[PDB]
Amino acid sequence: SGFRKMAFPSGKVEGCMVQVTCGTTTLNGLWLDDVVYCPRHVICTSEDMLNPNYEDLLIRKSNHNFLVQAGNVQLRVIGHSMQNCVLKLKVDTANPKTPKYKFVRIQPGQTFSVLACYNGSPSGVYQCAMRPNFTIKGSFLNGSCGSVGFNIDYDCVSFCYMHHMELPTGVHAGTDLEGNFYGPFVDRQTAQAAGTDTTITVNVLAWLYAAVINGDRWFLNRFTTTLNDFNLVAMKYNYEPLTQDHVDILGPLSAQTGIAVLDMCASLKELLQNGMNGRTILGSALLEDEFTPFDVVRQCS
């Protein structure tokens, strides 16, 4: 028995984190080969943030306006350019700790690990989901800007996310490592609103499977459902509609537990309609949606 929300081991990312300072603005950068990647708003003052012209602000900056520190080592900036919303600082030294890495763009509902950093120094690691509305319920914002999100496959760090901002509602938003925002957000101090935040249905079903693998079975009923009937109920409680592809990725958990996917959907239907009646599942009083099927399979062999 046991089911923890686990982050990926962070070591390969720790060796890439640097401090980037431009005047009184300090944040976190990612140092891969001879490039440091960071949020372009490092070149802005808190006043500049209302309606920045990033191209003109960037033109005004020279190499020597960027202080990059790796531990207690100052890196020399020899080039500065912009790719969408990320600043790229070419430095004179290739990161000798550079891992095997890719840049990927993840889908709403997918999970990743954040290496939370304070002013270029790794502070902590957590696992989260990209909400359906492309926001992140992140750690307390404390010198945290430019912290990155990543998955590990085999020997490769897949960098999927960089923190750029807090929205006025206190949720986090940011970009892929190509500097394209997730969701309709912009790196300027404008009242910006997120879409309505739905529960990630396939993740909730994956977690009910984790619960069953752990011998939690109280919420299994004798019913089944059709996808169509389930989705009528789901929509009423602000759950994403379940798709055939999502039923398909739950197949291995079905096979292992002896519980057909649509039977688990009929359990979830009743949990939504009736609540938990003051019981818990894997120690939780709420349905958890931050485990993908693949996360549950990873942890359960």
Place this chain on the structure above:
Amino acid sequence: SGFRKMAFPSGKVEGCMVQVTCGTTTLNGLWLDDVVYCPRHVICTSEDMLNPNYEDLLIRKSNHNFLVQAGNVQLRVIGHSMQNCVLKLKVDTANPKTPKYKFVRIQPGQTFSVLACYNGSPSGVYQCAMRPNFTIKGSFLNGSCGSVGFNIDYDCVSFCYMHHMELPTGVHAGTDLEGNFYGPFVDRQTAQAAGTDTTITVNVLAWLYAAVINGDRWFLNRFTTTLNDFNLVAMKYNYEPLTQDHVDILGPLSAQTGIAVLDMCASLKELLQNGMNGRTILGSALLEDEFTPFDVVRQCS
């Protein structure tokens, strides 16, 4: 806004994890300088586990019965000895990735990070508390035995825990890196029972403080309490009694929030007596006890 259960960055521990095999038994070892530390029950078959004589089983083993693999590198064992419940394998090579480290013994209610490993390979990292009954609600047991728990202070890994076993109830138990068990447990396949598992009161108060720092204030009432009156209620709901020392360590969170410790105790008293009335705190429907005051202070600057 934001409050995540964060683990320590795991990189310094990743470089110390090895596979230890004795016959058909494989588990995780910790390689620091020229010593590999692991659970002594690696020398036992599943049959040996009923009533092992570890001294006699160990005497029967030679160096070459221990297969230690670091990544895809075989380490030569040149010595085997026992310190309480941990096996120590002297190897011909000092771990060139050995961090600055200490061995500490933690107190019930203290938190640490576990680097969950599968057969010598880092799999994931999570933050947990040592329960008052000295058990760990750990990750799913999957090639996980010998995985270690640690804190980081400044540049130093404080190793506090090594997983030895699952109890029949599915909770985890283990030892300090000196091989002394936490709690009344023994590394043998005997029906072993834990003491009653109390809620870590000072951790719950620390988390209500985190909630307030994050602008969650619905559960603040106009009352105060005495320690004595609070502790009468606490004991009835299976909360550890609050001590003066515990009031003392909450002082910085009191100062920052403008909420006196005994005023937060009066909020907790009412939450225990009345429940949450279907509201949540920091997105939870249950009171969380896996953040120390020091964890909340770390994350909130």
